[PDB]
């Protein structure tokens, strides 16, 4: 008899930061680095998506023109010492708020803030990104 090994087919949508659709950020952090900044339960986290202009010295968008709270999708399987979070804005259901704002002004950037579930904790920022995470 012919052999059919177990094959998982990965399907889905990887990261997108483009006009006309939700931001999809498939982000991987280091567990050792999260644990160090006080992240004990990697499950207990909230994300804010910040749209605006970053501060020239710190890189933080302190006065976002738009913010959005996102409950991530968390893949069950992770590379050793890594932690994936899939952070996707609610554009499809909210009037395309994130994309319309982000791309209403070519100076604007999108920055992703990780905190604990209730907003506390050390604030862990992504780079303030341009289109296509540049």
PDB file of N, CA, C and O in Angstrom, residues 42-94:
ATOM      1  N   UNK A  42       1.912  34.908  29.038  1.00  0.00           N
ATOM      2  CA  UNK A  42       1.981  35.403  27.690  1.00  0.00           C
ATOM      3  C   UNK A  42       0.573  35.549  27.095  1.00  0.00           C
ATOM      4  O   UNK A  42       0.393  36.223  26.095  1.00  0.00           O
ATOM      5  N   UNK A  43      -0.410  34.908  27.714  1.00  0.00           N
ATOM      6  CA  UNK A  43      -1.803  34.982  27.258  1.00  0.00           C
ATOM      7  C   UNK A  43      -2.528  36.262  27.658  1.00  0.00           C
ATOM      8  O   UNK A  43      -3.508  36.625  27.013  1.00  0.00           O
ATOM      9  N   UNK A  44      -2.041  36.914  28.709  1.00  0.00           N
ATOM     10  CA  UNK A  44      -2.664  38.047  29.343  1.00  0.00           C
ATOM     11  C   UNK A  44      -2.090  39.353  28.826  1.00  0.00           C
ATOM     12  O   UNK A  44      -1.245  40.022  29.468  1.00  0.00           O
ATOM     13  N   UNK A  45      -2.542  39.696  27.637  1.00  0.00           N
ATOM     14  CA  UNK A  45      -1.988  40.832  26.906  1.00  0.00           C
ATOM     15  C   UNK A  45      -3.081  41.488  26.069  1.00  0.00           C
ATOM     16  O   UNK A  45      -4.021  40.830  25.581  1.00  0.00           O
ATOM     17  N   UNK A  46      -2.883  42.771  25.831  1.00  0.00           N
ATOM     18  CA  UNK A  46      -3.743  43.555  25.050  1.00  0.00           C
ATOM     19  C   UNK A  46      -2.846  44.301  24.098  1.00  0.00           C
ATOM     20  O   UNK A  46      -1.679  44.604  24.434  1.00  0.00           O
ATOM     21  N   UNK A  47      -3.380  44.619  22.934  1.00  0.00           N
ATOM     22  CA  UNK A  47      -2.643  45.413  21.944  1.00  0.00           C
ATOM     23  C   UNK A  47      -3.412  46.660  21.651  1.00  0.00           C
ATOM     24  O   UNK A  47      -4.635  46.646  21.624  1.00  0.00           O
ATOM     25  N   UNK A  48      -2.685  47.752  21.512  1.00  0.00           N
ATOM     26  CA  UNK A  48      -3.218  48.972  20.921  1.00  0.00           C
ATOM     27  C   UNK A  48      -2.489  49.253  19.612  1.00  0.00           C
ATOM     28  O   UNK A  48      -1.257  49.065  19.516  1.00  0.00           O
ATOM     29  N   UNK A  49      -3.259  49.626  18.600  1.00  0.00           N
ATOM     30  CA  UNK A  49      -2.732  50.028  17.330  1.00  0.00           C
ATOM     31  C   UNK A  49      -2.875  51.562  17.336  1.00  0.00           C
ATOM     32  O   UNK A  49      -3.960  52.136  17.548  1.00  0.00           O
ATOM     33  N   UNK A  50      -1.737  52.206  17.202  1.00  0.00           N
ATOM     34  CA  UNK A  50      -1.571  53.675  17.204  1.00  0.00           C
ATOM     35  C   UNK A  50      -1.302  54.269  15.801  1.00  0.00           C
ATOM     36  O   UNK A  50      -0.376  53.842  15.097  1.00  0.00           O
ATOM     37  N   UNK A  51      -2.103  55.249  15.385  1.00  0.00           N
ATOM     38  CA  UNK A  51      -1.833  55.897  14.101  1.00  0.00           C
ATOM     39  C   UNK A  51      -1.495  57.368  14.376  1.00  0.00           C
ATOM     40  O   UNK A  51      -2.246  58.082  15.074  1.00  0.00           O
ATOM     41  N   UNK A  52      -0.365  57.781  13.847  1.00  0.00           N
ATOM     42  CA  UNK A  52       0.100  59.169  13.990  1.00  0.00           C
ATOM     43  C   UNK A  52       1.553  59.361  13.620  1.00  0.00           C
ATOM     44  O   UNK A  52       2.127  58.571  12.848  1.00  0.00           O
ATOM     45  N   UNK A  53       2.153  60.395  14.196  1.00  0.00           N
ATOM     46  CA  UNK A  53       3.547  60.754  13.875  1.00  0.00           C
ATOM     47  C   UNK A  53       4.410  60.495  15.111  1.00  0.00           C
ATOM     48  O   UNK A  53       4.076  61.005  16.176  1.00  0.00           O
ATOM     49  N   UNK A  54       5.506  59.700  14.968  1.00  0.00           N
ATOM     50  CA  UNK A  54       6.347  59.373  16.119  1.00  0.00           C
ATOM     51  C   UNK A  54       7.214  60.483  16.563  1.00  0.00           C
ATOM     52  O   UNK A  54       7.558  61.387  15.776  1.00  0.00           O
ATOM     53  N   UNK A  55       7.533  60.426  17.841  1.00  0.00           N
ATOM     54  CA  UNK A  55       8.340  61.448  18.441  1.00  0.00           C
ATOM     55  C   UNK A  55       9.795  61.295  17.878  1.00  0.00           C
ATOM     56  O   UNK A  55      10.316  60.172  17.798  1.00  0.00           O
ATOM     57  N   UNK A  56      10.441  62.408  17.510  1.00  0.00           N
ATOM     58  CA  UNK A  56      11.730  62.335  16.809  1.00  0.00           C
ATOM     59  C   UNK A  56      12.860  61.672  17.648  1.00  0.00           C
ATOM     60  O   UNK A  56      13.838  61.120  17.111  1.00  0.00           O
ATOM     61  N   UNK A  57      12.740  61.743  18.972  1.00  0.00           N
ATOM     62  CA  UNK A  57      13.773  61.195  19.855  1.00  0.00           C
ATOM     63  C   UNK A  57      13.441  59.770  20.354  1.00  0.00           C
ATOM     64  O   UNK A  57      14.325  58.908  20.373  1.00  0.00           O
ATOM     65  N   UNK A  58      12.185  59.519  20.739  1.00  0.00           N
ATOM     66  CA  UNK A  58      11.793  58.218  21.354  1.00  0.00           C
ATOM     67  C   UNK A  58      11.181  57.241  20.372  1.00  0.00           C
ATOM     68  O   UNK A  58      11.182  56.029  20.651  1.00  0.00           O
ATOM     69  N   UNK A  59      10.643  57.729  19.251  1.00  0.00           N
ATOM     70  CA  UNK A  59      10.001  56.842  18.258  1.00  0.00           C
ATOM     71  C   UNK A  59       8.529  56.504  18.586  1.00  0.00           C
ATOM     72  O   UNK A  59       7.832  55.843  17.810  1.00  0.00           O
ATOM     73  N   UNK A  60       8.066  56.990  19.729  1.00  0.00           N
ATOM     74  CA  UNK A  60       6.705  56.702  20.181  1.00  0.00           C
ATOM     75  C   UNK A  60       5.722  57.737  19.599  1.00  0.00           C
ATOM     76  O   UNK A  60       5.965  58.952  19.580  1.00  0.00           O
ATOM     77  N   UNK A  61       4.597  57.217  19.159  1.00  0.00           N
ATOM     78  CA  UNK A  61       3.438  58.047  18.824  1.00  0.00           C
ATOM     79  C   UNK A  61       2.666  58.417  20.111  1.00  0.00           C
ATOM     80  O   UNK A  61       1.721  57.688  20.531  1.00  0.00           O
ATOM     81  N   UNK A  62       3.070  59.553  20.721  1.00  0.00           N
ATOM     82  CA  UNK A  62       2.483  60.007  21.956  1.00  0.00           C
ATOM     83  C   UNK A  62       1.087  60.590  21.790  1.00  0.00           C
ATOM     84  O   UNK A  62       0.272  60.512  22.712  1.00  0.00           O
ATOM     85  N   UNK A  63       0.818  61.181  20.638  1.00  0.00           N
ATOM     86  CA  UNK A  63      -0.472  61.848  20.412  1.00  0.00           C
ATOM     87  C   UNK A  63      -1.071  61.262  19.169  1.00  0.00           C
ATOM     88  O   UNK A  63      -1.147  61.949  18.152  1.00  0.00           O
ATOM     89  N   UNK A  64      -1.452  59.965  19.224  1.00  0.00           N
ATOM     90  CA  UNK A  64      -2.063  59.330  18.055  1.00  0.00           C
ATOM     91  C   UNK A  64      -3.313  60.095  17.595  1.00  0.00           C
ATOM     92  O   UNK A  64      -4.053  60.658  18.406  1.00  0.00           O
ATOM     93  N   UNK A  65      -3.503  60.154  16.291  1.00  0.00           N
ATOM     94  CA  UNK A  65      -4.752  60.674  15.715  1.00  0.00           C
ATOM     95  C   UNK A  65      -5.855  59.619  15.763  1.00  0.00           C
ATOM     96  O   UNK A  65      -7.021  59.935  15.757  1.00  0.00           O
ATOM     97  N   UNK A  66      -5.474  58.351  15.856  1.00  0.00           N
ATOM     98  CA  UNK A  66      -6.414  57.257  15.963  1.00  0.00           C
ATOM     99  C   UNK A  66      -5.715  56.135  16.818  1.00  0.00           C
ATOM    100  O   UNK A  66      -4.494  55.867  16.660  1.00  0.00           O
ATOM    101  N   UNK A  67      -6.454  55.577  17.766  1.00  0.00           N
ATOM    102  CA  UNK A  67      -6.019  54.358  18.428  1.00  0.00           C
ATOM    103  C   UNK A  67      -7.114  53.326  18.270  1.00  0.00           C
ATOM    104  O   UNK A  67      -8.279  53.658  18.083  1.00  0.00           O
ATOM    105  N   UNK A  68      -6.715  52.073  18.375  1.00  0.00           N
ATOM    106  CA  UNK A  68      -7.618  50.926  18.346  1.00  0.00           C
ATOM    107  C   UNK A  68      -7.090  49.791  19.247  1.00  0.00           C
ATOM    108  O   UNK A  68      -5.938  49.375  19.130  1.00  0.00           O
ATOM    109  N   UNK A  69      -7.934  49.296  20.149  1.00  0.00           N
ATOM    110  CA  UNK A  69      -7.611  48.138  20.978  1.00  0.00           C
ATOM    111  C   UNK A  69      -7.925  46.892  20.198  1.00  0.00           C
ATOM    112  O   UNK A  69      -8.985  46.831  19.529  1.00  0.00           O
ATOM    113  N   UNK A  70      -6.995  45.924  20.253  1.00  0.00           N
ATOM    114  CA  UNK A  70      -7.116  44.655  19.532  1.00  0.00           C
ATOM    115  C   UNK A  70      -6.842  43.457  20.435  1.00  0.00           C
ATOM    116  O   UNK A  70      -5.864  43.415  21.206  1.00  0.00           O
ATOM    117  N   UNK A  71      -7.746  42.502  20.365  1.00  0.00           N
ATOM    118  CA  UNK A  71      -7.591  41.244  21.072  1.00  0.00           C
ATOM    119  C   UNK A  71      -6.933  40.378  20.044  1.00  0.00           C
ATOM    120  O   UNK A  71      -7.476  40.207  18.972  1.00  0.00           O
ATOM    121  N   UNK A  72      -5.709  39.899  20.328  1.00  0.00           N
ATOM    122  CA  UNK A  72      -5.012  39.112  19.333  1.00  0.00           C
ATOM    123  C   UNK A  72      -5.579  37.690  19.173  1.00  0.00           C
ATOM    124  O   UNK A  72      -6.225  37.177  20.048  1.00  0.00           O
ATOM    125  N   UNK A  73      -5.327  37.112  18.009  1.00  0.00           N
ATOM    126  CA  UNK A  73      -5.391  35.675  17.796  1.00  0.00           C
ATOM    127  C   UNK A  73      -4.043  35.107  18.134  1.00  0.00           C
ATOM    128  O   UNK A  73      -3.063  35.598  17.648  1.00  0.00           O
ATOM    129  N   UNK A  74      -4.004  34.070  18.961  1.00  0.00           N
ATOM    130  CA  UNK A  74      -2.738  33.465  19.404  1.00  0.00           C
ATOM    131  C   UNK A  74      -2.615  32.023  18.910  1.00  0.00           C
ATOM    132  O   UNK A  74      -3.302  31.160  19.381  1.00  0.00           O
ATOM    133  N   UNK A  75      -1.785  31.787  17.915  1.00  0.00           N
ATOM    134  CA  UNK A  75      -1.444  30.432  17.451  1.00  0.00           C
ATOM    135  C   UNK A  75      -1.048  29.523  18.588  1.00  0.00           C
ATOM    136  O   UNK A  75      -0.323  29.967  19.530  1.00  0.00           O
ATOM    137  N   UNK A  76      -1.490  28.261  18.546  1.00  0.00           N
ATOM    138  CA  UNK A  76      -1.202  27.319  19.635  1.00  0.00           C
ATOM    139  C   UNK A  76       0.223  26.836  19.661  1.00  0.00           C
ATOM    140  O   UNK A  76       0.761  26.571  20.719  1.00  0.00           O
ATOM    141  N   UNK A  77       0.836  26.759  18.491  1.00  0.00           N
ATOM    142  CA  UNK A  77       2.183  26.242  18.313  1.00  0.00           C
ATOM    143  C   UNK A  77       3.191  27.332  17.998  1.00  0.00           C
ATOM    144  O   UNK A  77       2.971  28.180  17.145  1.00  0.00           O
ATOM    145  N   UNK A  78       4.291  27.320  18.734  1.00  0.00           N
ATOM    146  CA  UNK A  78       5.290  28.351  18.607  1.00  0.00           C
ATOM    147  C   UNK A  78       6.682  27.724  18.479  1.00  0.00           C
ATOM    148  O   UNK A  78       7.024  26.692  19.125  1.00  0.00           O
ATOM    149  N   UNK A  79       7.519  28.417  17.730  1.00  0.00           N
ATOM    150  CA  UNK A  79       8.934  28.099  17.697  1.00  0.00           C
ATOM    151  C   UNK A  79       9.507  28.136  19.148  1.00  0.00           C
ATOM    152  O   UNK A  79       8.996  28.872  19.976  1.00  0.00           O
ATOM    153  N   UNK A  80      10.572  27.368  19.416  1.00  0.00           N
ATOM    154  CA  UNK A  80      11.192  27.379  20.726  1.00  0.00           C
ATOM    155  C   UNK A  80      11.606  28.815  21.122  1.00  0.00           C
ATOM    156  O   UNK A  80      12.213  29.528  20.346  1.00  0.00           O
ATOM    157  N   UNK A  81      11.150  29.205  22.320  1.00  0.00           N
ATOM    158  CA  UNK A  81      11.388  30.506  22.936  1.00  0.00           C
ATOM    159  C   UNK A  81      10.690  31.675  22.262  1.00  0.00           C
ATOM    160  O   UNK A  81      10.984  32.831  22.603  1.00  0.00           O
ATOM    161  N   UNK A  82       9.771  31.417  21.344  1.00  0.00           N
ATOM    162  CA  UNK A  82       9.062  32.504  20.641  1.00  0.00           C
ATOM    163  C   UNK A  82       7.588  32.540  21.021  1.00  0.00           C
ATOM    164  O   UNK A  82       7.040  31.542  21.474  1.00  0.00           O
ATOM    165  N   UNK A  83       6.954  33.686  20.779  1.00  0.00           N
ATOM    166  CA  UNK A  83       5.530  33.851  21.005  1.00  0.00           C
ATOM    167  C   UNK A  83       4.906  34.701  19.909  1.00  0.00           C
ATOM    168  O   UNK A  83       5.242  35.900  19.750  1.00  0.00           O
ATOM    169  N   UNK A  84       4.004  34.051  19.162  1.00  0.00           N
ATOM    170  CA  UNK A  84       3.255  34.679  18.051  1.00  0.00           C
ATOM    171  C   UNK A  84       1.944  35.299  18.565  1.00  0.00           C
ATOM    172  O   UNK A  84       1.210  34.722  19.379  1.00  0.00           O
ATOM    173  N   UNK A  85       1.685  36.511  18.104  1.00  0.00           N
ATOM    174  CA  UNK A  85       0.380  37.152  18.246  1.00  0.00           C
ATOM    175  C   UNK A  85      -0.022  37.700  16.873  1.00  0.00           C
ATOM    176  O   UNK A  85       0.774  38.336  16.197  1.00  0.00           O
ATOM    177  N   UNK A  86      -1.273  37.448  16.485  1.00  0.00           N
ATOM    178  CA  UNK A  86      -1.820  37.951  15.243  1.00  0.00           C
ATOM    179  C   UNK A  86      -2.751  39.102  15.610  1.00  0.00           C
ATOM    180  O   UNK A  86      -3.829  38.889  16.217  1.00  0.00           O
ATOM    181  N   UNK A  87      -2.317  40.317  15.245  1.00  0.00           N
ATOM    182  CA  UNK A  87      -2.988  41.565  15.618  1.00  0.00           C
ATOM    183  C   UNK A  87      -3.606  42.128  14.331  1.00  0.00           C
ATOM    184  O   UNK A  87      -2.882  42.404  13.386  1.00  0.00           O
ATOM    185  N   UNK A  88      -4.958  42.184  14.274  1.00  0.00           N
ATOM    186  CA  UNK A  88      -5.708  42.567  13.063  1.00  0.00           C
ATOM    187  C   UNK A  88      -6.736  43.594  13.485  1.00  0.00           C
ATOM    188  O   UNK A  88      -7.461  43.353  14.449  1.00  0.00           O
ATOM    189  N   UNK A  89      -6.746  44.739  12.797  1.00  0.00           N
ATOM    190  CA  UNK A  89      -7.645  45.832  13.111  1.00  0.00           C
ATOM    191  C   UNK A  89      -9.072  45.448  12.635  1.00  0.00           C
ATOM    192  O   UNK A  89      -9.205  44.510  11.875  1.00  0.00           O
ATOM    193  N   UNK A  90     -10.092  46.158  13.103  1.00  0.00           N
ATOM    194  CA  UNK A  90     -11.508  45.825  12.853  1.00  0.00           C
ATOM    195  C   UNK A  90     -12.137  46.561  11.620  1.00  0.00           C
ATOM    196  O   UNK A  90     -13.373  46.791  11.572  1.00  0.00           O
ATOM    197  N   UNK A  91     -11.312  46.889  10.628  1.00  0.00           N
ATOM    198  CA  UNK A  91     -11.752  47.724   9.471  1.00  0.00           C
ATOM    199  C   UNK A  91     -13.044  47.281   8.793  1.00  0.00           C
ATOM    200  O   UNK A  91     -13.946  48.091   8.553  1.00  0.00           O
ATOM    201  N   UNK A  92     -13.103  45.982   8.501  1.00  0.00           N
ATOM    202  CA  UNK A  92     -14.276  45.364   7.883  1.00  0.00           C
ATOM    203  C   UNK A  92     -15.606  45.724   8.589  1.00  0.00           C
ATOM    204  O   UNK A  92     -16.617  45.855   7.939  1.00  0.00           O
ATOM    205  N   UNK A  93     -15.607  45.900   9.908  1.00  0.00           N
ATOM    206  CA  UNK A  93     -16.833  46.117  10.693  1.00  0.00           C
ATOM    207  C   UNK A  93     -16.941  47.512  11.303  1.00  0.00           C
ATOM    208  O   UNK A  93     -17.931  47.776  12.005  1.00  0.00           O
ATOM    209  N   UNK A  94     -15.941  48.393  11.131  1.00  0.00           N
ATOM    210  CA  UNK A  94     -16.050  49.679  11.801  1.00  0.00           C
ATOM    211  C   UNK A  94     -16.019  50.900  10.872  1.00  0.00           C
ATOM    212  O   UNK A  94     -15.838  52.010  11.364  1.00  0.00           O
TER     213      UNK A  94
END
